[PDB]
């Protein structure tokens, strides 16, 4: 019985980067060349693990965070970067075992005036730790008079449209990301590949 | 009311040091984008550095590893400290509240630096 | 980097006239584009946002208009106090970049 990677890769809405969707995988078989082979994403990129040997190895858990940033933004989805998007919407952690991947999503999530369901946060006090989601909108105040849930001067409403358009420069079109995880505890290892 | 001042420009030879400094009211420095800016005389507006709230900071790549920004929160204040100055780093350098993603809305009047020999 | 281009100065306008300053930008920067006003000896003021945003304040003579690599500033009745230097500058990239500067002085 499969892994459902087809649930995460092919769902037909995607989050926004800043509420990120997490999938926890378990208790199934995952063949990774599936994704590996395709040749679909222009980013694939793995981080203590070899793509290929995937599918010879076994893990406790496998999560699936999936978010669209946009092209340019991919390459923050690494360890040790800083940014908008890493210090402040989605922070991996310096020891990361997992793979990131990535594709263009012009045809789905580009709207022609404007695609405004898809955020990012845009005024944080403090970098995100790794793996966290914050999803409050409360009203950041960038001065010292306290805002009080009320927008205005200094008083900013926290996340930030990319309003993605029908564009021809590609660093600013839409991404699609997916981001596994392989988790190892003392525990059965329930995410296993077809080798075992 | 609200209120952003640098000071600490002047008369520098190159190769020689300053520390550029900006007290800012109202406007709170460590939980904004500030940004320092600069303008040559009679030429246009080069952004030179960044330091986002979280601690990140980014530079113009003619100044990586010559200027340095900081802050002191407990003074409000925003610092670049500029090292290796060069004859082409005169101008006026203005602090500027980057309202996020590089948009300054607010800028100090600015304090002029010449670098020459 | 991206390299922004405005029109030499100076543009000649009188009181009542309707002004429009041009941008190019080297590549597509989607509407990313800001507007910003100098008077000499003065530091910048922002005028415009996402290209076409009115900042909170300017008079409603200024507007914005544009997308991917060509821009418009345009104050429809020119007033006394809006002789200046105008800068375009694309925002929301890794390096955020000018343009040169479009001065409007007097006409005679």
């Known amino acids: 019985n499969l892994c459902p990677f087809g649930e995460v890769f092919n769902a037909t809405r995607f989050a926004s980067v800043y509420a990120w969707n997490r999938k926890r995988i378990s208790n199934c078989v995952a063949d990774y060349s599936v994704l590996y082979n395709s040749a679909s994403f222009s980013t694939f990129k793995c981080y203590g693990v070899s793509p290929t040997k995937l599918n010879d190895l076994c893990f406790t858990n496998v999560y699936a965070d999936s978010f669209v940033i946009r092209g340019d933004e991919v390459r923050q989805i690494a360890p040790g970067q800083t940014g908008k998007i890493a210090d402040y919407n989605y922070k991996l952690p310096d020891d990361f075992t997992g793979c990131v991947i990535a594709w263009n999503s012009n045809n789905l999530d580009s709207k022609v005036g404007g695609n405004y369901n898809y955020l990012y946060r845009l005024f944080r006090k403090s970098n995100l730790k790794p793996f966290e989601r914050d999803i409050s909108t409360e009203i950041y105040q960038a001065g010292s008079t306290p805002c009080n849930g009320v927008e205005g001067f200094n008083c900013y409403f926290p996340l930030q449209s990319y309003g993605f358009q029908p564009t021809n420069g590609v660093g600013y079109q839409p991404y699609r990301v997916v981001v596994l995880s392989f988790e190892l505890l003392h525990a059965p290892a329930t995410v296993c590949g077809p080798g075992s | 009311e609200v209120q952003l001042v640098e000071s600490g420009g002047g008369l520098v030879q190159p190769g020689g040091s300053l520390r550029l400094s900006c007290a800012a009211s109202?406007?709170?420095?460590?939980?904004?984008?500030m940004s320092w800016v600069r303008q040559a005389p009679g030429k246009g507006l080069e952004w030179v550095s960044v330091?986002?709230?979280?601690?990140?900071?980014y530079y113009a790549d003619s100044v990586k590893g010559r200027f340095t920004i900081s802050r002191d929160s407990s003074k409000n204040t925003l610092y670049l400290q500029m090292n290796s100055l060069r004859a082409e780093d005169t101008a006026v350098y203005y602090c500027?509240?980057?309202?996020?993603?590089?948009?300054?809305?607010?800028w100090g009047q600015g304090t002029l630096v010449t670098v020459s020999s | 980097d991206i390299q922004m281009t405005q029109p030499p100065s100076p543009l000649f306008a009188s009181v009542g006239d309707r002004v429009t300053i041009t941008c190019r930008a080297s590549?597509?920067?989607?509407?990313?584009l800001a507007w910003y006003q100098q008077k000499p000896g003065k530091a910048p003021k922002l005028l415009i946002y996402?290209?076409?945003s009115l900042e909170s304040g300017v008079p409603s003579r200024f507007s914005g208009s544009g997308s991917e690599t060509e821009f418009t500033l345009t104050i429809s009745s020119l007033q006394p106090d809006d002789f200046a230097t105008y800068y375009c500058?694309?925002?929301?990239?890794?390096?955020?970049?000018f343009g040169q500067g479009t001065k409007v002085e007097i006409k005679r």
């Open positions: 500027a509240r980057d309202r996020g993603d590089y948009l300054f809305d607010y």
């Open positions: 109202e406007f709170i420095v460590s939980r904004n984008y």
């Open positions: 330091i986002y709230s979280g601690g990140t900071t």
């Open positions: 590549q597509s920067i989607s509407s990313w």
């Open positions: 996402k290209a076409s």
């Open positions: 500058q694309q925002y929301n990239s890794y390096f955020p970049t």
